[PDB]
Enzyme design. Structure first.
Site, short mmCIF file in Angstrom:
data_model
loop_
_atom_site.label_atom_id
_atom_site.label_comp_id
_atom_site.label_asym_id
_atom_site.label_seq_id
_atom_site.Cartn_x
_atom_site.Cartn_y
_atom_site.Cartn_z
N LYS A 1 -2.69 46.24 -5.95
CA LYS A 1 -2.51 47.66 -6.26
C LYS A 1 -3.89 48.30 -6.14
CE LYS A 1 -1.45 51.61 -8.17
NZ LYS A 1 -0.52 52.60 -7.53
N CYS B 1 -4.53 58.75 -1.52
CA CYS B 1 -3.60 58.87 -2.65
C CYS B 1 -3.25 60.34 -2.88
CB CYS B 1 -4.20 58.28 -3.93
SG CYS B 1 -3.04 58.30 -5.32
#
Ligand SMILES: Cc1cc2nc3c(=O)[nH]c(=O)nc-3n(C[C@H](O)[C@H](O)[C@H](O)COP(=O)(O)O)c2cc1C
Ligand SMILES: Cc1cc2nc3c(=O)[nH]c(=O)nc-3n(C[C@H](O)[C@H](O)[C@H](O)COP(=O)(O)O)c2cc1C
Ligand SMILES: [Mg+2]
Ligand SMILES: [Mg+2]
Lengths: 311, 311
Positions: A43, A130
């Site tokens: 992650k 992101c």
């Protein structure tokens, strides 16, 4: 038939999880190691542990998914400590991928410095896209800032490095980005992260379905395959051969995988579909892709890799 | 139930065709006039008649469509002559919309000056987002160039003007564009044009499905609704109230229309769905929307317009 060579390493097949999906904890990672995935990635991490955005922050949709996780992660040290220990066991074919998504340029440089100094022998993925961090736009949409960061990164980072990019929708943007990236000894480009700031509405309740950012979130799944394939193909015909590509976006069936490979992707990552199906997806999709190859008489990905035909 | 006020004009309902679909010829336009569409808009025109890109250039997809038409149109004079004659007949409630997409800033200024000088009393839509003109990127992705063009436009154009915009995927971009647009006496913003440069592949033939630009084309339909709704909503909360919004993208059912209206759209345009179904779609979707309103006890769009709820 799916044996793949990427970043000078050998993988049993090109399939991997997409960062952010089924890779938050050591338990998640071990589950990916145990699966048929050719490789896996952690992650995206930040220097300090993050709780992420308020719930609900992820919702399954008929045509994909929408989310605004907010980079929840257990912190850089947690993931580094994990990859370093597993590295010593030599219990898997192919290196582990390590994703970082610093809250700032300084944080990214700091983490990259730590990786460089550590004994980590795997692959690093710098997330410049992101779309769910409040008040923090996707860096890869700021060509100037992106080039400035990468120049500093390569003054010291000598280990395998790839960049996770957001989707582009104008050919001139692909030209600009390719020119910027081609000047560096980058290992790869991973296209694409979610289509940013999309919206899903529950018509009955007349409201959005996720709590953060008034319901705006990253879109994944079937919704984005056309965009994902375009990005993979556009960079494939523009990047110098030294920079390989990881295809990500809308991969659910062997056919979807086949299409990404035809475009030029070498490795393939599964996000939304994996989130819904679990690690068992790797065995299913591998078989689906092999069936497609068998029907076509192909015995290796090289038989069709990047061979998408124009009219 | 669907009576709508837009650009200080009255329309029977908010539905229209999206520019580029079923509006190429006078025959197409008369068909839209005869339909139940509340209003209609002409195909984006250029100073000179254009044949467009090579075929195949449009393909129906399970989740929408892909195309690279290349702005085929019968020329500015053809459309202007038509709208001017039609205006004199007073044979329809609500003005006709006139779309222009000059091959250059000079061409756009030239057409706008001709419209300004003509007796045209309808509404004009300046297309700053065609993603299918080879070597010509979407102008609305160049904030500097966009502001420069609009400033010159408003030094002389006093008639109703709206701008057709491409989709944005970063909140800062919505902020930047809103700041630029809010300084002008714009009538409206139309979000969104197609998701640019997507790719669709026929896995069996291992090739793209449209001939121009190696298969890259604008994506419309179900694929883009999340993006379209987000753009409509993001501008609704940022634009000054003087600038209204036309919602375009993924509208096929009354529920899709309901969602766009809930976001803040006043008028609604249908592209892909109209291309597939024909003008009969307007009757169908109007009834579907009215049924949704009846079940909710709503008698006017004002009962839910822009009332999308956050969590
Ligand atoms: C719940 C969720 C979390 C994600 N978090 C990350 C992340 O931390 N880092 C990253 O690079 N991408 C992240 N992404 C995006 C994916 O890696 C992938 O690029 C995206 O979902 C497009 O692929 P898909 O169509 O298979 O879902 C996330 C996606 C989802 C659905
Ligand atoms: C065949 C075709 C031609 C189009 N030509 C134009 C055009 O000339 N001008 C314009 O502003 N938009 C054009 N568009 C885009 C549409 O107006 C609309 O913005 C897009 O299709 C998104 O809506 P949809 O999801 O309902 O298809 C075209 C779309 C299609 C499918
Ligand atoms: Mg394994
Ligand atoms: Mg009519």
């Amino acid at each position: 038939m799916l044996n793949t060579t990427f970043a000078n390493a050998k993988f049993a097949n090109p399939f991997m999880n997409a960062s952010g999906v089924h890779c938050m904890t050591i338990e998640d990672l071990e589950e990916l190691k145990a699966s048929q995935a050719g490789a896996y990635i952690t992650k995206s991490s930040t220097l300090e542990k993050r709780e992420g955005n308020p719930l609900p922050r992820y919702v399954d949709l008929e045509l994909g998914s929408i989310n605004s996780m907010g980079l929840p992660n257990l912190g850089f040290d947690y993931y580094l400590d994990y990859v370093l220990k597993n590295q010593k066991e030599n219990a898997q074919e192919g290196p582990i991928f390590f994703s970082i998504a610093g809250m700032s340029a300084a944080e990214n440089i700091a983490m990259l410095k730590k990786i460089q100094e550590s004994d980590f022998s795997g692959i690093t993925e710098l997330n410049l896209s992101c779309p769910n961090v409040p008040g923090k736009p996707q860096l890869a949409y700021d060509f100037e800032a992106t080039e400035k960061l990468l120049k500093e990164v390569f003054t010291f980072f000598t280990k395998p490095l790839g960049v996770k990019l957001p989707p582009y929708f104008d050919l001139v943007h692909f030209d600009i980005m390719a020119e910027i990236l081609n000047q560096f000894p980058l290992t790869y480009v991973n296209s694409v992260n979610s289509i940013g700031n999309g919206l899903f509405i529950d018509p009955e309740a007349e409201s959005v379905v996720i709590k953060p950012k008034d319901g705006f979130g990253g879109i994944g799944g079937a919704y984005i395959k056309p965009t994902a394939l375009a990005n993979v193909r556009a960079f494939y015909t523009r990047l110098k051969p030294e920079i390989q590509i990881i295809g990500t976006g809308g991969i659910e069936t062997g056919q979807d995988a086949f299409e990404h490979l035809l475009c030029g992707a070498t490795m393939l990552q599964i996000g939304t579909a994996l989130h819904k199906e679990g690690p068992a997806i790797f065995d299913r999709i591998i078989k689906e892709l092999e069936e497609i190859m068998n029907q076509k008489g192909y015995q290796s990905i090289a038989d069709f890799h990047g061979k998408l035909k124009s009219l």
